């Protein structure tokens, strides 16, 4: 570390170098900071969290007891130790709180002002975070399992939305038009994600072990279909063409977005070439999933190494994205963990499990 | 070593109640040395992972006075304790399966009582133990 502040100081490297690299040592040393928690609110498992993009300071969280909870993530007390205090609560007493599980929960990318979240009661609600009351709501009539807002897309404020139908609902913020839909799915799609590089580039992931890239201006189906093998079991597509050998129930754009994470009840992860969905064969090993819902899992920002965080039973399994070297196994929570969010302001991580808690884990020293 | 002979002599069936003597010269002995310890709890999965259920309860026990006495197993159970916090996820809630569940329900019960204690006893920092009580009050107690 002296060597690199040395390095910074005199111009030898790039201060570029001293960040990423630092950045990805905190990484490699994250841990369970009991120094740090999380206030519990959620009497249920809490299934997704969503650190806000701008500012990373709160931070949402979505129960399967239908509460929404808003935290503030700044140490705002003087001492050390400090809880992460529930700012805001969508509770069993809101008139617009969801009757079910909150599946996803999203900050509104560009401003802190606005959140949506979907539930399995068919609707997927926005919210307007200073008075804490539904802006709008879309029924939907089968139940979500995912929704998600481009992070890019300066233009169009679409809403992809993943219920068990085999369709892909695309909701309109702007003036509302939830009737569009992208078909070729067979069965419920589990995660949707668009690519943080390209504004109209949506990734689906059904049950069906197809995950497919839609352009959603396109008026011509999907762009691509993820396929295991690139082409060395070759069918006329009706049945092949599958990205997993189960549901794929997790997707992930890297940082870049240059690549795709998918991640299956066949109990693999693996990376797709975003813009030929082609496999790079990165092994990862066996990442054990068995989620019956979609998994949401992240990967890291602004590190020398991209990682990725990925619910492992129990435990949240940190791969190396580009080389599939499994860094380490995050052990602190007491069932299946559900949704692990990055803080990549200060590389800490937020894991929301089926105990009821959202753990805080923290680089150590 | 000794602390298997300890181990012997306390975890036995045959007079299963607890004995004061012995209990504090364990106590006496962890604290001289802390590797007595660290090879106690590999005792102690010995004893959980035996046949007997009384075994079981003494190895239970024995874990629980180390942790709250010596001082060494306090270093055990309250850090580098991801092995304490399983075997208190495995033990009162249900094996994973195909393996089922095979301690007493009177053992159950002890579990219960002793992580109701441990929550006050020692939760300075380690908060797992209520989320886990908590837990097993709102799925397999």
């Not at chain 1, 064969?281 to 992240?298: E, I, M, P």
């Not at chain 1, 965080?309 to 499994?326: L, R």
């Not at chain 2, 190895?59 to 010596?70: G, H, K, N, T």
Request: glycine fraction near 6%; aromatic fraction near 8%.
């Amino acid at each position: 570390m002296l060597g690199f502040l040395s390095a910074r100081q005199t111009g030898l490297e790039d201060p570029l170098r001293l960040r990423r690299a630092e950045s990805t040592r905190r990484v490699l040393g994250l841990e369970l900071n009991k120094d740090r928690d999380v206030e519990r609110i959620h009497g249920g498992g809490i299934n997704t969290l969503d650190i806000e993009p701008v500012e990373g300071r709160y931070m949402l969280s979505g129960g399967s007891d239908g509460v929404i909870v808003l935290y503030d993530l700044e140490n705002s007390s003087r001492q050390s130790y400090y809880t992460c205090k529930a700012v805001c609560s969508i509770g069993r007493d809101h008139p617009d709180v969801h009757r079910y599980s909150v599946e996803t929960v999203q900050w509104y990318p560009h401003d802190t002002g606005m959140f949506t979240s979907s539930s399995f009661d068919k609707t997927l609600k926005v919210w307007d975070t200073n008075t804490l009351q539904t802006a709008d709501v879309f029924n939907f009539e089968e139940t979500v399992y995912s929704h998600h807002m481009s992070p890019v897309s300066t233009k169009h404020c679409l809403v992809a939305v993943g219920t068990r139908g085999p369709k892909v609902q695309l909701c309109d913020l702007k003036s509302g038009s939830c009737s569009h839909i992208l078909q070729g799915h067979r069965q419920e799609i589990l995660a949707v994600s668009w690519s943080p590089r390209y504004d109209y580039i949506l990734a689906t992931a059904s049950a069906d072990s197809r995950v497919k890239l839609w352009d959603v201006r396109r008026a011509s189906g999907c762009l691509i279909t993820l396929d295991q093998h690139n082409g060395k079991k070759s069918q006329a597509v009706e049945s092949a063409n599958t990205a997993h050998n189960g549901k794929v129930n997790g997707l992930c754009f890297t940082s870049d977005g240059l690549h795709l994470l998918t991640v299956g009840t066949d109990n693999r992860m693996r990376l797709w070439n975003s813009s030929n969905g082609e496999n790079t064969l990165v092994n990862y090993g066996k990442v054990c999933n068995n989620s019956k819902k979609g998994l949401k899992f992240t990967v890291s920002c602004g590190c020398s190494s991209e990682f990725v965080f990925v619910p492992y039973g129990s435990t949240i399994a940190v791969y190396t994205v580009y080389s599939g070297e499994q860094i380490t196994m995050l052990k602190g929570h007491y069932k299946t963990v559900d949704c692990c969010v990055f803080q990549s302001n200060f590389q800490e991580l937020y894991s929301g499990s089926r105990d009821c808690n959202i753990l805080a884990w923290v680089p150590s020293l | 070593q000794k602390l298997s002979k300890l181990v012997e002599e306390l975890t036995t069936s045959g007079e299963p109640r607890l004995n004061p003597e012995k209990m504090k010269e364990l106590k006496k002995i962890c604290k001289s040395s802390e590797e007595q310890l660290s090879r106690a709890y590999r005792l102690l999965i010995a004893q959980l992972t035996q046949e007997h259920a009384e075994i079981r309860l003494s190895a239970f026990q024995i874990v629980e006075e180390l942790f709250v006495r010596s001082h060494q197993f306090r270093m055990l159970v309250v850090s580098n304790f991801q092995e304490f916090l399983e075997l208190t996820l495995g033990t009162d809630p249900a094996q994973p399966l195909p393996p089922p569940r095979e301690a007493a329900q009177r053992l159950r019960q002890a579990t219960t009582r002793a992580v109701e204690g441990w929550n006050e006893k020692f939760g300075e920092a380690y908060k797992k133990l209520a989320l886990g009580y908590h837990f097993l009050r709102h799925n397999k107690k």
